[PDB]
Amino acid sequence: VNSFSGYLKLTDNVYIKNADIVEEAKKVKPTVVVNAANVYLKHGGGVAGALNKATNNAMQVESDDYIATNGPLKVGGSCVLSGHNLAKHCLHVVGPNVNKGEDIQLLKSAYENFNQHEVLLAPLLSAGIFGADPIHSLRVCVDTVRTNVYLAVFDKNLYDKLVSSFL
Ligand SMILES: OC[C@@H]1C[C@@H]2CCC[C@@H]2N1c1ncnc2[nH]ccc12
């Protein structure tokens, strides 16, 4: 039993809700919140910019130190950093950016990072400003993640479409 509320169950291990991941994180304070990061951990907009804003830029400060030490992430890769006032931890995951010419096959690799955590609050990777199809992304999530994932879908129209076409 966990403190997530109002989610639809999609499969044995995937749950979805029409919600802003930032608001879900503030309310639930989960163990792991996923960020839809880029390789530079430059949290400008979308999921990342909104999460970072909610941390009063502490996420960006921590991220800049991480990059100065370790260099950029790989597309498809991740790192675990603090969750600040939103969660215990933040799993920064880089999906491929199709508007950069990056291979959509790396989306499966991106979701594989979720399997290192028993329970996560997450967005749909590569959706939004990353340019990918959110229905394809939801299917990759369902077919890749085996741990318990609670998906927050920001756009109501998209949520309705994902749920109705899922079977
Ligand atoms: O797939 C990520 C979706 C696509 C949307 C268009 C751009 C970013 C948006 N995303 C969000 N998803 C969940 N919570 C969110 N809070 C703020 C943004 C946001």
Curated annotation (Swiss-Prot):
What does the entry report regarding how activity is regulated? Inhibited in vitro by GRL-0617.
Where is this gene product found?
Host endoplasmic reticulum membrane
Q: How does it sit in the membrane?
A: Multi-pass membrane protein
- Domain of life, per lineage: Viruses
Q: Where would I find the Macro domain in this sequence?
A: 1-167
List the catalysed reactions.
Answer: Thiol-dependent hydrolysis of ester, thioester, amide, peptide and isopeptide bonds formed by the C-terminal Gly of ubiquitin (a 76-residue protein attached to proteins as an intracellular targeting signal)
The record describes the protein's role as: Responsible for the cleavages located at the N-terminus of the replicase polyprotein. Participates together with nsp4 in the assembly of virally-induced cytoplasmic double-membrane vesicles necessary for viral replication. Antagonizes innate immune induction of type I interferon by blocking the phosphorylation, dimerization and subsequent nuclear translocation of host IRF3. Also prevents host NF-kappa-B signaling. In addition, PL-PRO possesses a deubiquitinating/deISGylating activity and processes both 'Lys-48'- and 'Lys-63'-linked polyubiquitin chains from cellular substrates.
**Subunit text:** May form homohexamers. Interacts with N protein.
Q: What is this protein's name?
A: Papain-like protease nsp3
Show the taxonomic lineage: Viruses, Riboviria, Orthornavirae, Pisuviricota, Pisoniviricetes
